[PDB]
Design an enzyme around this catalytic site. Structure first.
Site, short mmCIF file in Angstrom:
data_model
loop_
_atom_site.label_atom_id
_atom_site.label_comp_id
_atom_site.label_asym_id
_atom_site.label_seq_id
_atom_site.Cartn_x
_atom_site.Cartn_y
_atom_site.Cartn_z
N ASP A 1 0.84 -1.01 -0.09
CA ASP A 1 -0.05 0.11 -0.06
C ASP A 1 0.82 1.24 -0.05
OD1 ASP A 1 -2.26 1.72 0.84
OD2 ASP A 1 -3.46 -0.25 0.96
N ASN B 1 -13.74 0.40 -7.22
CA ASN B 1 -14.72 1.28 -6.89
C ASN B 1 -15.27 2.13 -7.98
OD1 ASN B 1 -13.66 0.93 -4.06
ND2 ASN B 1 -12.17 2.33 -4.33
N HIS C 1 -3.77 6.07 3.62
CA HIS C 1 -4.43 4.99 3.09
C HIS C 1 -3.90 3.51 3.62
CE1 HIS C 1 -7.05 2.87 0.15
NE2 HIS C 1 -6.14 2.14 0.17
N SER D 1 -10.92 -0.69 -0.75
CA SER D 1 -9.82 -0.69 -0.13
C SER D 1 -9.91 -0.85 1.61
CB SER D 1 -9.06 0.60 -0.06
OG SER D 1 -8.55 0.83 -1.28
#
Ligand code: CA
Ligand code: CA
Length: 282
Positions: free
Chosen positions: A39, A159, A72, A224
Site C-alpha cells: 500500500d 470502486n 491509506h 480498500s
C-alpha cells in the site's frame, strides 16, 4: 474476548444478522501471523500498532523508507491489526510501500513489492492489496506466484461500480477478491461486483488509524477498507491453522460467510458477507 464500543465494520463481521450489537468478539488475535500491507506505507509509530508494525520495503524512493504520507496504508493496516480498530489485534504488520503520497505508484514497483513478499514473507502470512488498476497480466502473474508460494492474498474489488473482472489484481481467481458493503448491508454505491468477487465486507464509513499523528483517526470508504477485514479474518484463521494453504483459507472464509444478506449485490455477485466466527475443540 469481547470488545465493547466497537466501530461498525468490526461489529458487523462477528455476527450473521443485523441489528449491530456494538460489540466485536474474537477468540484468536492473529498472534504468530504476519500481515504484509502492500500500500502507501504504514505510520508504524501509531498507537494502534503497539510496536507490531515495521517497514520492510519501499519502491517509491522519496526518502520515507516505508512510512505513509498518504494515510491509506495506515488506515488499512489499522483495520487488519489495530488494537482498537483492527480484526487481528496481535498480528505482526509489515509495510510494503508501493504507492506514494498521492496513492499512486508504478506497476513495476507494485510487482516488485509482491515479489518481495513472495521471497521474504514469514509464514503463516497474509498479504493485503487495497489497490489496483488496469488489467496487467504481469501483476496477475506476480500475485498468482505469491499465492502459489503459500501466501493468502486479500484483493480489493475496486470502486467503479463495474464488473471487477476487468481489473488487476481483482481478477486473480486464487486471491480473495472483496466487495464493499454499508452499515445497512447494501452493496456500496461505488463497489465493483460480479463473478470475480469472493464475498463482501464492510467498506463504507470505516474508522481506523491515520497519519496526521500517532493518535489520529479517519473515517473513509472504499473496497480498500473492505479488504483488510478479510485479511484480518484470514489472520485469525491462520493462527489456528498455520499450515493452511491459500485455497484452504479461501474456502474457509467463503464457506463460513453469511449468505443472502447483501442488498443490490450486482450482476453475478456472490451474495456472501464476511463472518469471523470459527469454532474450536473444548
Ligand atoms: Ca457485533
Ligand atoms: Ca479473486
Amino acid at each position: 474476548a469481547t470488545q465493547t464500543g466497537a466501530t461498525w465494520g468490526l461489529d458487523r463481521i462477528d455476527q450473521r444478522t443485523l441489528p449491530l450489537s456494538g460489540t466485536f468478539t474474537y477468540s484468536n488475535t492473529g498472534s504468530g501471523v504476519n500481515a504484509y500491507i502492500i500500500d502507501t506505507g504504514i505510520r508504524v509509530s501509531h498507537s494502534e500498532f503497539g510496536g507490531r508494525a515495521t517497514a520492510v520495503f519501499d519502491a517509491i524512493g522519496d526518502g520515507q523508507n516505508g512510512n505513509d504520507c498518504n494515510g491509506h496504508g495506515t488506515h488499512v493496516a489499522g483495520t487488519v491489526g489495530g488494537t482498537v480498530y483492527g480484526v487481528a489485534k496481535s498480528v505482526r504488520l509489515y509495510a510494503v510501500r508501493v504507492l506514494n503520497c498521492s496513492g499512486s505508484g508504478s506497476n513495476s514497483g507494485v510487482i516488485a513489492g509482491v515479489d518481495w513478499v513472495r521471497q521474504n514473507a514469514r509464514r503463516p502470512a497474509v498479504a493485503n492489496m487495497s489497490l489496483g488498476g488496469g488489467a496487467s497480466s504481469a501483476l496477475d502473474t506476480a500475485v498468482n506466484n505469491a499465492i502459489n508460494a503459500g501466501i493468502t492474498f486479500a484483493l480489493a474489488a475496486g470502486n467503479s461500480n463495474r464488473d471487477a473482472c476487468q481489473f488487476s489484481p481483482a481478477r486473480v481467481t486464487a486471491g480473495i477478491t472483496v466487495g464493499a458493503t454499508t452499515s445497512t448491508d447494501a452493496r456500496a454505491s461505488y463497489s465493483n461486483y460480479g463473478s470475480c468477487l469472493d464475498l463482501f465486507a464492510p467498506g463504507s464509513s470505516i474508522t481506523s488509524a491515520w497519519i496526521s499523528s500517532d493518535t489520529s483517526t479517519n473515517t473513509i470508504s472504499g473496497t480498500s477498507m473492505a479488504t483488510p477485514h478479510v485479511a484480518g479474518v484470514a489472520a485469525l484463521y491462520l493462527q489456528s491453522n498455520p499450515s493452511a494453504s491459500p485455497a484452504t483459507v479461501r474456502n474457509a472464509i467463503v464457506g463460513n460467510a453469511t449468505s443472502g444478506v447483501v442488498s443490490n449485490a450486482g450482476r453475478r455477485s456472490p451474495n456472501l458477507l464476511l463472518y469471523s466466527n470459527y469454532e474450536n475443540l473444548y
